[PDB]
Amino acid sequence: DPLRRTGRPFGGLIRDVRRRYPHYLSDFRDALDPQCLAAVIFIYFAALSPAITFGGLLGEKTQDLIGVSELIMSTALQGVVFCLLGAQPLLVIGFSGPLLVFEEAFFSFCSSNHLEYLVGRVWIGFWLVFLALLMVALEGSFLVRFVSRFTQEIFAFLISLIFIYETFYKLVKIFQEHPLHGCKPRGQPNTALLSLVLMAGTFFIAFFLRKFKNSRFFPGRIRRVIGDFGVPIAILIMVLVDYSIEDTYTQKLSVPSGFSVTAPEKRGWVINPLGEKSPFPVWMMVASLLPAILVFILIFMETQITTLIISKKERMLQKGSGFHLDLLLIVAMGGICALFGLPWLAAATVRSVTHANALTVMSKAVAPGDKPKIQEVKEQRVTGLLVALLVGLSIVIGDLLRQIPLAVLFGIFLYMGVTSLNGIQFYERLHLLLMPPKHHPDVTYVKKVRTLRMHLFTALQLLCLALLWAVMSTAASLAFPFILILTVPLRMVVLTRIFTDREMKCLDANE
Amino acid sequence: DPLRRTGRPFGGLIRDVRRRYPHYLSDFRDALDPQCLAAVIFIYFAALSPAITFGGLLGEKTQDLIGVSELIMSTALQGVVFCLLGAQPLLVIGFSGPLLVFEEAFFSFCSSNHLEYLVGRVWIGFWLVFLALLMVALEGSFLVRFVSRFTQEIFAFLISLIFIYETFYKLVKIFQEHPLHGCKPRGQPNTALLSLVLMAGTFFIAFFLRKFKNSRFFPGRIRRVIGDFGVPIAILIMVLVDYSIEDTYTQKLSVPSGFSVTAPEKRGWVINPLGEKSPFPVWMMVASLLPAILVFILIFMETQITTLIISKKERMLQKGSGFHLDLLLIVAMGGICALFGLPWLAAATVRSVTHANALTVMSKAVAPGDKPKIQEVKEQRVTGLLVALLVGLSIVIGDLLRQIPLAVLFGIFLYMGVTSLNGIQFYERLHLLLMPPKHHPDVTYVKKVRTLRMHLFTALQLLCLALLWAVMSTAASLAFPFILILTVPLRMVVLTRIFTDREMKCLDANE
């Protein structure tokens, strides 16, 4: 049991080192395999797409301070370091939705308080490194056991709603900027309507190709390969559509050529922690701990829940693991990295399972067709190292990246926020609220609890989400991570009195 | 058995009369019921929409000679007469796709041969009446038994393809007329992407609403009501969308006010058979027999097959049938009706099944549940007569019909041509050409015949369709009705030699 209080300082980390690094030769020896070559392209595309789209969003929101070049460099550096000297090489590192929300909230708060956006970031990172060291030294990584399904589903639903809502707003802004009138440019014909066509065309191509994977058409070998290319194909089709129309203006993303620093007129490659243009107030270096705690919660929750999912007994990963070394490495890198600008990164649970699923080799089954035994996972470090290097050497092609319309990306930004709602039991219980009770499916949380006591759980769980959404839209949007972890004590004491022990074994089951 | 050669000249007509007319009182007495009032609005909408859309097509195709007013008047008159003095009033009379194709072909032939378009139509009408009388007097209505599934599926697939192809052509023409350029009107900003948005929006609203009917969401009573409103809701939504945009130009269908004659500057309410402006040639009054035969086949094939489907043993219609009287009434009416302009009409199989479904009464189920026994159908004359009189008094609201965009209608033209492909066994066998043989469904024509002998039948059936489509795209696109019935002799003599008896009982089964 990795999550056990040994009692010695840095005990868990030392145990992770001693049970992981002795195998530093097999991780490089197991590189020679066609499966690795097949997976290195799929995961490379799956990591590049939510790098350019998130960089575009961040460049628009952060007033062209952190753009596409910065996020790509950060992803490349952190991925290379983590894969080279980490403990779970299958765990990919990438920018996430909650981090984007927190960054825009911090930017708004800093703007509405006359401070400098990139000077307080360095102090946030400085406090974050110390906080991570203190948490690792006291063996506090066992707290992940206290986060049940009641919180993860709420958080996932909130993030999906944010993704969905950050696209209709952009459409509304485009129609307000380029109105439909008879005969930043600020008013062009055939621009507000091509944008609507462009992101609707790319959402439906990618949606239907994903639906084509699960279908029974075509041989299984060809169907599986094409199905994995749902997003890369959708971008390629719609870029060629806009390339043919050369007389109409459409907004395109901005990638500086070479190794520039995203409009080098407001920022340099090195940020002065003491002050750039005006003295930094004395009260914003010893009171920069409260924001450091809130950002630490998001990184801790994303990075540790993902390790639980990938280390489940269903997946036969027997080489070692990491629960203390991985957290110390990720958080301490972000604090040092924030000195040079650049954003913080966390582990991505959607891309990590895809990375692992592309490396497992199934067994044979003379028995009727099912999901057979999973012998070996072919775990290694070579596959994850090359991908982080390939994303790094994607800024030399900035000439081709500058031809991608901004509307094409927002179509996928909506696709990623709507196909992420599957598997969320909070989402499935929402359909059951409309279906007649005779049509409900045969699931564990249906037969063991009567329906009137099942809708009360959903209403209580949905009430919390509305309350947390409202906080994020006020002037105190910086404090929403605190409310997120405030639901865990609620389930310990409040739900226990109102719900019997019988109910809270099928609704909250972690299996 | 109505289809039996009695031997007397007008045997079938008198046989139908003496078993249909004596109970004239019951057909009017059975009117008082809420089912009729519920079904009348549904069938009214289902008959009105493919009258305005077909009139919109016909106005453009026929150079504003037969438009929307004429088609509505023809539908109203023929419906009233048929429902008043005809057998089996459950039939719904309406303009069909094959008739539209034939009228377009005849218009092209008349244009490319210096003849007038509405003068030869009257002679075709007289000849059509003569052959209807001759056909009925010789008891030739039993020939419908010789048309098997091999011909009906080909005909349906060809019509659906024509419907689909008559929309992308219109989109291409709009985009060539209103090109995308920087800053009949013949060139306006926007008004080319709006048309693409308008017909894509109305196709998806109607498509998803139909998919909502089969779902398990919502109470059963509410689901079926708004489920039947797939098309009327889709039109209402997209008209309100184009009403808000008042600065952009969108093409709208032309409905003359009052009882005008669709631009009465080139036509009158009466047509001179001997000539309007120039002496009509002597060699198109005795050689209009060939077009009269060809149009007779379409009316004969479409009308009689519909009666068989409605009078199947599954539907408990035992009140009397009209295999003989209906054909004489419909065909002879069109010949007289063509004297006053106006188009020919035939019974519609899609709206006839829907009309019967809306009046049937299911029974209770002691068993766990299936489609129970059908107790009574409530066949009558009042329901069909009111609808024909309600479509007729829809030209007084021509001010409201003039605000419907022409792009909204073509969205439903494509919807009708794609949801009509279900139930066609020729369409279902086309999917099986791509599925792996392990995934084929549990269907009768799958296990009894090996797969390699099943794809030969589909390829032979598909080869005929391509040959029939080729003749329709040439300058001799008038003999395609003749080629259509030429498939029946092919199956009698040619296919039976190459296929064993075992195969031609599951592929060609009529049950």
Numbering used by the authors:
A (entry chain A), B (entry chain B): 673 to 855, 893 to 1220
From the article:
Anion exchanger 2 (AE2) works at high cellular pH to catalyze the exchange between the intracellular HCO3− and extracellular Cl−, thereby maintaining the pH-homeostasis. Here, we determine the cryo-EM structures of human AE2 in five major operating states and one transitional hybrid state. Among those states, the AE2 shows the inward-facing, outward-facing, and intermediate conformations, as well as the substrate-binding pockets at two sides of the cell membrane. In conclusion, given the presently revealed structural models, the AE2 uses NTD as the intracellular pH sensor to mediate the anion-exchanging activities of its TMD, thereby maintaining pH homeostasis.
To further explore the conformational changes of hAE2 upon the cellular pH shift, we conducted EM studies on hAE2 at basic pHs and determined the structure of hAE2 at a pH of 8.32 (hAE2basic-KNO3). Two major classes of particles were sorted after the 3D classification, and upon the map refinement and structural modeling, two EM structures of hAE2basic-KNO3 were determined as homodimers in two different conformations. Similar results were observed when hAE2 was purified in a NaHCO3-free solution of pH 8.32, and AE2 deprived of chloride/bicarbonate at basic pHs in two conformations (hAE2interbasic-KNO3, hAE2outbasic-KNO3), with resolutions of 3.25 Å, 3.09 Å, respectively. The co-existence of the hAE2 in the intermediate and outward-facing conformations at basic pH indicates a more flexible TM arrangement of AE2 upon the pH elevation, which might result from the disengagement of the TMD and NTD. Along with the elevated intracellular pH, the loopTM10/11 is dissociated from NTD. When the cellular pH raises along with the acid secretion, the pH shift-induced conformational change, possibly in NTDs, would release the loopTM10/11 from NTD to allow the helical re-arrangement in TMD, resulting in the removal of loopCT from the inner vestibule and thus allowing the access of bicarbonates to the substrate binding site (“ready to load” state, hAE2interbasic-KNO3).
